[PDB]
Design a protein around this motif. Sequence first.
Motif, PDB file in Angstrom:
ATOM      1  N   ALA A 113       0.816  -1.219   0.000  1.00  0.00           N
ATOM      2  CA  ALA A 113       0.000   0.000   0.000  1.00  0.00           C
ATOM      3  C   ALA A 113       0.855   1.277   0.000  1.00  0.00           C
ATOM      4  CB  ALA A 113      -0.984  -0.007   1.159  1.00  0.00           C
ATOM      5  N   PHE A 114       1.927   1.276   0.799  1.00  0.00           N
ATOM      6  CA  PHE A 114       2.983   2.319   0.807  1.00  0.00           C
ATOM      7  C   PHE A 114       3.584   2.599  -0.585  1.00  0.00           C
ATOM      8  CE2 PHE A 114       6.541   4.715   2.650  1.00  0.00           C
ATOM      9  CZ  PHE A 114       7.634   4.355   1.868  1.00  0.00           C
ATOM     10  N   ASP A 115       4.005   1.547  -1.296  1.00  0.00           N
ATOM     11  CA  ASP A 115       4.525   1.707  -2.659  1.00  0.00           C
ATOM     12  C   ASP A 115       3.477   2.306  -3.600  1.00  0.00           C
ATOM     13  OD1 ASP A 115       6.890   0.591  -1.688  1.00  0.00           O
ATOM     14  OD2 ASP A 115       6.638  -1.303  -2.752  1.00  0.00           O
ATOM     15  N   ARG A 116       2.229   1.847  -3.471  1.00  0.00           N
ATOM     16  CA  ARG A 116       1.107   2.376  -4.263  1.00  0.00           C
ATOM     17  C   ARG A 116       0.816   3.870  -4.043  1.00  0.00           C
ATOM     18  NH1 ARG A 116      -2.220  -1.364  -2.566  1.00  0.00           N
ATOM     19  NH2 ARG A 116      -0.891  -3.153  -3.064  1.00  0.00           N
ATOM     20  N   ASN A 117       0.887   4.325  -2.793  1.00  0.00           N
ATOM     21  CA  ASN A 117       0.763   5.757  -2.487  1.00  0.00           C
ATOM     22  C   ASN A 117       1.914   6.580  -3.074  1.00  0.00           C
ATOM     23  OD1 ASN A 117      -1.635   5.241  -1.047  1.00  0.00           O
ATOM     24  ND2 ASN A 117      -0.493   4.935   0.868  1.00  0.00           N
ATOM     25  N   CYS A 118       3.123   6.021  -2.985  1.00  0.00           N
ATOM     26  CA  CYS A 118       4.325   6.628  -3.543  1.00  0.00           C
ATOM     27  C   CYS A 118       4.292   6.660  -5.068  1.00  0.00           C
ATOM     28  CB  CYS A 118       5.560   5.891  -3.051  1.00  0.00           C
ATOM     29  SG  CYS A 118       6.046   6.390  -1.388  1.00  0.00           S
ATOM     30  N   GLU A 119       3.706   5.614  -5.657  1.00  0.00           N
ATOM     31  CA  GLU A 119       3.463   5.552  -7.101  1.00  0.00           C
ATOM     32  C   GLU A 119       2.424   6.571  -7.536  1.00  0.00           C
ATOM     33  OE1 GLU A 119       2.246   1.532  -7.685  1.00  0.00           O
ATOM     34  OE2 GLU A 119       4.254   0.728  -7.334  1.00  0.00           O
ATOM     35  N   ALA A 172       1.908   8.870   2.273  1.00  0.00           N
ATOM     36  CA  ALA A 172       2.427   7.514   2.095  1.00  0.00           C
ATOM     37  C   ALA A 172       1.741   6.534   3.043  1.00  0.00           C
ATOM     38  CB  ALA A 172       3.935   7.499   2.307  1.00  0.00           C
ATOM     39  N   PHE A 173       1.109   7.087   4.078  1.00  0.00           N
ATOM     40  CA  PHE A 173       0.585   6.320   5.196  1.00  0.00           C
ATOM     41  C   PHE A 173      -0.928   6.467   5.331  1.00  0.00           C
ATOM     42  CE2 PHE A 173       4.872   7.992   5.999  1.00  0.00           C
ATOM     43  CZ  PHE A 173       5.591   6.804   5.961  1.00  0.00           C
ATOM     44  N   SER A 174      -1.409   7.706   5.198  1.00  0.00           N
ATOM     45  CA  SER A 174      -2.792   8.112   5.477  1.00  0.00           C
ATOM     46  C   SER A 174      -3.166   7.907   6.961  1.00  0.00           C
ATOM     47  CB  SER A 174      -3.796   7.445   4.507  1.00  0.00           C
ATOM     48  OG  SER A 174      -5.063   8.088   4.535  1.00  0.00           O
ATOM     49  N   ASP A 175      -4.329   8.432   7.333  1.00  0.00           N
ATOM     50  CA  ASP A 175      -4.949   8.198   8.634  1.00  0.00           C
ATOM     51  C   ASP A 175      -6.442   8.437   8.460  1.00  0.00           C
ATOM     52  OD1 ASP A 175      -5.172  11.092   8.785  1.00  0.00           O
ATOM     53  OD2 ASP A 175      -3.213  11.158   9.777  1.00  0.00           O
ATOM     54  N   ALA A 176      -7.209   8.271   9.540  1.00  0.00           N
ATOM     55  CA  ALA A 176      -8.667   8.416   9.499  1.00  0.00           C
ATOM     56  C   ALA A 176      -9.110   9.843   9.176  1.00  0.00           C
ATOM     57  CB  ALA A 176      -9.297   7.934  10.801  1.00  0.00           C
ATOM     58  N   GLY A 189     -10.966  10.394   0.166  1.00  0.00           N
ATOM     59  CA  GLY A 189      -9.658   9.868   0.559  1.00  0.00           C
ATOM     60  C   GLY A 189      -8.794   9.532  -0.638  1.00  0.00           C
ATOM     61  N   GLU A 190      -7.664  10.224  -0.735  1.00  0.00           N
ATOM     62  CA  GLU A 190      -6.741  10.112  -1.866  1.00  0.00           C
ATOM     63  C   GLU A 190      -5.760   8.943  -1.733  1.00  0.00           C
ATOM     64  OE1 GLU A 190      -4.249  13.577  -2.487  1.00  0.00           O
ATOM     65  OE2 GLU A 190      -3.860  13.065  -4.570  1.00  0.00           O
ATOM     66  N   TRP A 191      -5.475   8.548  -0.492  1.00  0.00           N
ATOM     67  CA  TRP A 191      -4.434   7.563  -0.204  1.00  0.00           C
ATOM     68  C   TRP A 191      -4.981   6.294   0.437  1.00  0.00           C
ATOM     69  CZ3 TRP A 191      -0.833   9.676  -2.987  1.00  0.00           C
ATOM     70  CH2 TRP A 191      -0.750  11.083  -3.052  1.00  0.00           C
ATOM     71  N   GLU A 192      -4.329   5.168   0.139  1.00  0.00           N
ATOM     72  CA  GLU A 192      -4.590   3.899   0.808  1.00  0.00           C
ATOM     73  C   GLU A 192      -3.914   3.900   2.172  1.00  0.00           C
ATOM     74  OE1 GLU A 192      -3.192   1.530  -3.022  1.00  0.00           O
ATOM     75  OE2 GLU A 192      -4.388   0.236  -1.709  1.00  0.00           O
ATOM     76  N   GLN A 193      -4.630   3.408   3.180  1.00  0.00           N
ATOM     77  CA  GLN A 193      -4.059   3.214   4.506  1.00  0.00           C
ATOM     78  C   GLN A 193      -2.974   2.131   4.459  1.00  0.00           C
ATOM     79  OE1 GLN A 193      -4.896   5.347   6.901  1.00  0.00           O
ATOM     80  NE2 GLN A 193      -3.235   4.493   8.146  1.00  0.00           N
ATOM     81  N   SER A 194      -1.741   2.525   4.770  1.00  0.00           N
ATOM     82  CA  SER A 194      -0.602   1.602   4.803  1.00  0.00           C
ATOM     83  C   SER A 194      -0.061   1.411   6.220  1.00  0.00           C
ATOM     84  CB  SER A 194       0.513   2.087   3.874  1.00  0.00           C
ATOM     85  OG  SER A 194       1.099   3.287   4.351  1.00  0.00           O
ATOM     86  N   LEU A 195      -0.398   2.345   7.113  1.00  0.00           N
ATOM     87  CA  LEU A 195       0.093   2.365   8.493  1.00  0.00           C
ATOM     88  C   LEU A 195      -0.963   1.874   9.480  1.00  0.00           C
ATOM     89  CD1 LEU A 195       2.689   3.578  10.215  1.00  0.00           C
ATOM     90  CD2 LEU A 195       1.100   5.481  10.625  1.00  0.00           C
ATOM     91  N   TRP A 196      -0.596   0.881  10.286  1.00  0.00           N
ATOM     92  CA  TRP A 196      -1.548   0.322  11.251  1.00  0.00           C
ATOM     93  C   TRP A 196      -0.943   0.113  12.629  1.00  0.00           C
ATOM     94  CZ3 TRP A 196      -6.424  -0.124   9.029  1.00  0.00           C
ATOM     95  CH2 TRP A 196      -6.480  -0.252   7.622  1.00  0.00           C
ATOM     96  N   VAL A 197      -1.798   0.222  13.647  1.00  0.00           N
ATOM     97  CA  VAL A 197      -1.492  -0.242  14.999  1.00  0.00           C
ATOM     98  C   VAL A 197      -2.086  -1.641  15.128  1.00  0.00           C
ATOM     99  CG1 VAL A 197      -1.839   0.131  17.501  1.00  0.00           C
ATOM    100  CG2 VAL A 197      -1.317   2.059  16.027  1.00  0.00           C
ATOM    101  N   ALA A 249       7.809  -3.579   8.983  1.00  0.00           N
ATOM    102  CA  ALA A 249       7.508  -3.440   7.557  1.00  0.00           C
ATOM    103  C   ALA A 249       7.075  -4.789   6.999  1.00  0.00           C
ATOM    104  CB  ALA A 249       8.705  -2.886   6.793  1.00  0.00           C
ATOM    105  N   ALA A 250       5.843  -4.851   6.495  1.00  0.00           N
ATOM    106  CA  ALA A 250       5.219  -6.127   6.101  1.00  0.00           C
ATOM    107  C   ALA A 250       4.550  -6.095   4.726  1.00  0.00           C
ATOM    108  CB  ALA A 250       4.219  -6.570   7.169  1.00  0.00           C
ATOM    109  N   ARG A 251       4.288  -7.288   4.187  1.00  0.00           N
ATOM    110  CA  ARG A 251       3.552  -7.481   2.936  1.00  0.00           C
ATOM    111  C   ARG A 251       2.530  -8.602   3.115  1.00  0.00           C
ATOM    112  NH1 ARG A 251       8.466  -5.473  -0.338  1.00  0.00           N
ATOM    113  NH2 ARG A 251       7.420  -3.753  -1.423  1.00  0.00           N
ATOM    114  N   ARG A 252       1.295  -8.339   2.687  1.00  0.00           N
ATOM    115  CA  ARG A 252       0.240  -9.358   2.634  1.00  0.00           C
ATOM    116  C   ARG A 252       0.122  -9.903   1.214  1.00  0.00           C
ATOM    117  NH1 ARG A 252      -4.425  -5.287   4.847  1.00  0.00           N
ATOM    118  NH2 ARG A 252      -4.175  -3.661   3.262  1.00  0.00           N
ATOM    119  N   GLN A 253       0.100 -11.231   1.101  1.00  0.00           N
ATOM    120  CA  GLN A 253       0.062 -11.919  -0.193  1.00  0.00           C
ATOM    121  C   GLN A 253      -1.265 -11.675  -0.909  1.00  0.00           C
ATOM    122  OE1 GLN A 253       3.161 -13.427  -0.355  1.00  0.00           O
ATOM    123  NE2 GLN A 253       2.980 -13.812  -2.558  1.00  0.00           N
ATOM    124  N   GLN A 254      -1.183 -11.419  -2.214  1.00  0.00           N
ATOM    125  CA  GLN A 254      -2.348 -11.087  -3.039  1.00  0.00           C
ATOM    126  C   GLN A 254      -3.218 -12.311  -3.327  1.00  0.00           C
TER     127      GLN A 254
END
Lengths: 398, 397
Positions: B33-39, B255-259, B272-280, B370-375
């Motif tokens: 999601a981070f790469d996508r926001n940066c893209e 790059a991260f977004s929030d609520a 909302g322009e950005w995908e949420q990439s940052l989570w607790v 820093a993580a990745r979820r499989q598609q």
Amino acid sequence: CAATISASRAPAHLGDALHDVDTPALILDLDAFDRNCEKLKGVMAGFPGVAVRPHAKAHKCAEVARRQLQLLGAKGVCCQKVIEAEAMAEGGVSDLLLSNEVIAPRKIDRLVGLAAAGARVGVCYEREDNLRQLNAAAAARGTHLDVLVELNVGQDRCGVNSADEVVQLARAAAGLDNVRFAGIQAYHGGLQHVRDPRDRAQRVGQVVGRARAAVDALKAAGLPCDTVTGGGTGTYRVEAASGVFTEVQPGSFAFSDADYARNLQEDGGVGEWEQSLWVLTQVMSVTPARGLAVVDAGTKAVSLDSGPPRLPPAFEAAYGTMMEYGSGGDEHGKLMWPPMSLPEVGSLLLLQPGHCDPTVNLYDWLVAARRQGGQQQGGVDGWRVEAVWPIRGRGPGQ
Amino acid sequence: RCAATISASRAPAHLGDALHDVDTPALILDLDAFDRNCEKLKGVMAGFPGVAVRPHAKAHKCAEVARRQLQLLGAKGVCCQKVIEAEAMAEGGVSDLLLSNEVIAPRKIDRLVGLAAAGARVGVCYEREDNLRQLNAAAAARGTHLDVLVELNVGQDRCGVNSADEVVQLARAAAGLDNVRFAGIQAYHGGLQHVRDPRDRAQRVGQVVGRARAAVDALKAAGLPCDTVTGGGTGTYRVEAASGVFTEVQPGSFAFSDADYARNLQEDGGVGEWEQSLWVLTQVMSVTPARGLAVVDAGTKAVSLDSGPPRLPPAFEAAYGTMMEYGSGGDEHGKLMWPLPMSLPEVGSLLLLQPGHCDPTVNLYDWLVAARRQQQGGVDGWRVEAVWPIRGRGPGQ
Ligand SMILES: [Mg+2]
Ligand SMILES: [Mg+2]
């Protein structure tokens, strides 16, 4: 080595004045701190047979806990998370109540490892499966754990909702080998900042009855209730007086904040405790056309979670009026006049936290200092740094 | 003795871990999601040629993040709000830094100038000649130079000068110093970043544009250049970049977004322009049915409520039926409450929270997972790619 520059580099050293302290910084006035510990002890003399277990979640610092225990003549502390118990244990604070449930296997293992290391450990539970895994981890390390049922007494956070439910869980503990039912935690955090002393006492009365109903149900069932713990800085007077509670858990008393400063009491007095905890901040911008002096301590240096921080009485001396703190975002604090001298750019100021515990948790080090007495509280002149202590339990709450 | 803090000495995860291996509460970054926001930011910016992106490192305080941002963006440098963030960037090989704020403490100046002397390209803001002179003095002492930008108040009423005349005079002062170089201006209005509709955001930033252009034109009338006109953020950047006045935009949160940022309406009709990439990442540590309550281990100390409560993702609603609301449970507890067939998450279950405000929440952690979820959300299909120190975390030294 360390994960952050801040946790590798102290903002001051032994013998510094406040002008040598890198900002923003967390300051503990040991003189006022000692006096608060003295005051609590003196109040508690009026209630013999009631122990004080000061809450380490306020300060997260082992050297603070050691001093509290020495001054209080107390035996142990409370920790909200395993990481605080880890911080206390490594600094030789060896009597611990984890005043909360711990359900994660890896966190339970850390807590149990402290009891194995020689520490006297209590922990709260509200569930049999949790009790069973508590017991199992304890058994694996050849150690024991004191276990206390948490009762919901009106805060509606964690804990059981009936005296019957207390009995059932005590019944469950009886048959396990590495766990001992030690009583109940009855903490109502929602009554701590009740302004009116009569209203506060009336509300604690209800908490006292709920706790009594639980002790009596256990007695009816032929089970003991060796410890009844709870209460805090706001309510401890009423819990201690009850004859039901055996232990009180105040944490904020030692430091105070702008919330607790507003608590009216039985006498002619607003706010029970002297402010010993300060955020030291430097003015980095002035705009006389507005009302404005901007300080370097923003959101990240002072928590606004219970309202804005407050400028002390010494600020009003030789500035004329008391200006107010508003947020300027992450790294700016706006000081605004509601005319005379604004603080000069480069000048230092002490800010009373709006809420003590979260503010402390923003810092990696605590600067312990003393000033020379008979002085107006919160001026930056004439301090000497006695110690700079690592806040070993700082973090999100592992 | 590794760190002042146990948490800063002990990482919450390691390489290869699933999210169930991650000690809670934790800060997770979805790199996908981070790469996508940066893209996405890069794509938009391709529409505004001549305008550079200088992403704000105060959002993340992590050198490995800045490094990835710049590579994805093809950009040269970052902003830092305090010297500590600049030190953290420079030790991690990020060598082109703007200190997007004023620094007045001599010990802090020495640190910053120290980076410039070590080879970093350093820019810094000012609003006073005495501060300008100390900047120059320290720079000269270490045999280095500093780019200097006059900050102008353009509506936020935080710091900066309030007239173009002030800009001119300060620039004239920088003009005749040997180890300082007047680089232009910073004109940032933080108050407009969360203006909701694109029209109102275009209308109010246009006023900021006019104030900034006045400063450039006054400088040009005085025979002084205004090379860099830097400002804007995650909310306003499109209008700043569209203006023909700004040479640089400063978005950090993108790059991260929030609520909070998720609620800004966009030109295309999207909220909302950005995908949420940052989570607790948090654990349910208590359940009370018929209170309709699941208590999580992430309280005040794990998620900042400074701009609103954290939010549960759509994947939570998909699994449990309805969306629960986060309320404060004090320092170490988060209360998740029902707003229907009652189905609560079990004790021990793992949940992802979208922070109400990204930067103050980031600053609560010592490490970034820093993580990745499989598609989205969901705690199920992740692997930890890296566990990075947030070397800039703190009160803001
Ligand atoms: Mg508190
Ligand atoms: Mg922000």
